[PDB]
Write a protein that binds this ligand. Structure first.
Ligand SMILES: [Fe+3]
Ligand SMILES: [Fe+3]
Ligand SMILES: [Fe+3]
Ligand SMILES: [Fe+3]
Lengths: 194, 194
C-alpha cells in the first residue's frame, strides 16, 4: 500500500493533492500513475514504487517561487538553482516539500521524482519509467505523442532518448535556457535513437 | 598585411590552402574572410584580424582523425576531446596545426578560430564576428540564412544567439551529440533573442 512509503492512504493523498493542484494537473498525475504502472510491468520495475512516484511527480508544481527559494536555502541546495525556475524546481527542489508533507524517505522514489523533468546521465529504471510516463500518459495530446507511445512499447532507453531529444529541440526552438543536466541526459541517451 | 601574423603572404596562403582543402571549402573560407571583414567594420573589430581569422577558420577541416588524436596527445589537451570528432576538433584542436604550419601566435586570432564551431559562454567581439561570419557568408544557402543575415546587420549578440539556438535545435532534431561548450554558449546568449 502507499502507506508503506507515505504517512497517509492513497485516498487521503488524492484529497490533499486536489487542494494543492488544479483539476487538469491532478488528472495528469493520475495519468502518470497509470502509465508508470504499465511501463514498470513492461520493464521490470516495482509497480508500486512506479505508481506512487508517478502520482507524486508533479505534487509541488504550484509552489511559489519564494517557497522554492526558501527550500533551496533551508536544504543548502546547489546555489545555481536560484538562477532557474518552476520547471527545474518542482522536481529538483519539490522533493523536499513532498518529504516534509508526506514523510516520504524512500531514496528510489525521491530520486525518480527529483529528476523527472531534467533526467540524469545515469538513471535507474524507476527514474526512466517516471520520466517516460510523464510524457506518454493518456491525457497528453501533443504532435508526436503517438511516436513516443510506440517507442515506449518497445524500449525504455529509446523512449528516454526520444523524449530528451524532442525536449532539447523544443527548448531551442522556443529560445528557452536548457538546464545543463538536461544535456547530460541528452548526450548519455542519444545513441539509443539508432 | 597577413605576414604581420603568419609566415607567408595572403597569395602564398591561398596556394597552400588550395592543396589542403576541396574547392568548395576554400570558396567558403574566402566567403568567411569577406563576411568577417564586413562584420568587423560594423561592430568595431580589427578588420585585418577578422579577415585573417575568417580565411583560416576551416584550415584544418580535412585533417584525419588520427592527426587530431596525435595533436590532443602532443599538446596534452582535454582528454575528453577524444570522445568527439572533426566538428569539435577542426577548430578546438586544429589551431595547433595552423600554429605549426603558419607560425600563427596571435592569441586573439587563435581563440576566434578555436571556438568558431562551439562558441563559449564568454566571447570576444572578434570571436563573435568569426562565429557569425561562418554562418552568413555569401556562399551559404540554407533555409533561414536570410534571417541570420538580417539579424547580423543589426546586432552581433543577437546573431550569435540566433545561430546557436538554430544549431542546438538542428543537432537535437538530427539526433547528434551536443558538445557541452555549445550549450554554455547557448545559455549565455539566448537572452538576446528577446
Ligand atoms: Fe513535472
Ligand atoms: Fe508531469
Ligand atoms: Fe568550421
Ligand atoms: Fe566554416
Amino acid at each position: 500500500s502507499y502507506q508503506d512509503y507515505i504517512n497517509c492512504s492513497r485516498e487521503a493523498l488524492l484529497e490533499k493533492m486536489a487542494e494543492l493542484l488544479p483539476e487538469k494537473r491532478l488528472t495528469h498525475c493520475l495519468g502518470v500513475e497509470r502509465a508508470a504502472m504499465e511501463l514498470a510491468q513492461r520493464f521490470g520495475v516495482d509497480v508500486e514504487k512506479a505508481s506512487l512516484a508517478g502520482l507524486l511527480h508533479d505534487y509541488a508544481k504550484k509552489l511559489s517561487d519564494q517557497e522554492f527559494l526558501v527550500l533551496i536555502d533551508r536544504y543548502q541546495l546547489d546555489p545555481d538553482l536560484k538562477n532557474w525556475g518552476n520547471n527545474v524546481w518542482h522536481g529538483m527542489v519539490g522533493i523536499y516539500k513532498i518529504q516534509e508533507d508526506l514523510d516520504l524517505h524512500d531514496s528510489e522514489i525521491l530520486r525518480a521524482i527529483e529528476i523527472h523533468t531534467v533526467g540524469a546521465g545515469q538513471m535507474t529504471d524507476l527514474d526512466k519509467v517516471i520520466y517516460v510516463a510523464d510524457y506518454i500518459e493518456h491525457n497528453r495530446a501533443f504532435p508526436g505523442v503517438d511516436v513516443a507511445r510506440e517507442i515506449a512499447s518497445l524500449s525504455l532507453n529509446k523512449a528516454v532518448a526520444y523524449e530528451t531529444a524532442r525536449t532539447v529541440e523544443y527548448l531551442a526552438h522556443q529560445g528557452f535556457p536548457i538546464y545543463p543536466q538536461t544535456l547530460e541526459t541528452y548526450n548519455a541517451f542519444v545513441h539509443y535513437l539508432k
